[PDB]
Amino acid sequence: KTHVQLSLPVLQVRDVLVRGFGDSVEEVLSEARQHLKDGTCGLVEVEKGVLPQLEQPYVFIKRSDAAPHGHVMVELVAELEGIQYGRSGETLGVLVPHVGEIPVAYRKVLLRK
Secondary structure: OOEEEEEEEEOOHHHOOOOOOOOOHHHHHHHHHHHHHHOOEEEEOOOOOOHHHOOOOEEEEEEOOOOHHHOEEEEEEEEEOOEEEOOOOOEEEEEEEOOOOOOOEEEEEEEEO
């Protein structure tokens, strides 16, 4: 399937134990996709002071279309020192590994895979 229905656990930034996916744009995008497939991917909603508490490169999920079954359609865009690799709509948040942190909510998305 080109798209996969996922419910992503929304984590508070100060709870997150592993604050990024790796060390290159290509690695974070690869790791993000692997974790999304394995259901070990969390989502941190971006606000003032959230991104400086996480590790670059960042992986964003961004709205790719204006929402089957409640699931917003999203795609991945990485960012490293202010350059984004990808072009998409509004940020739904930043992806991080999930290693058992208690979520505050769940974000139903349809991931272009």
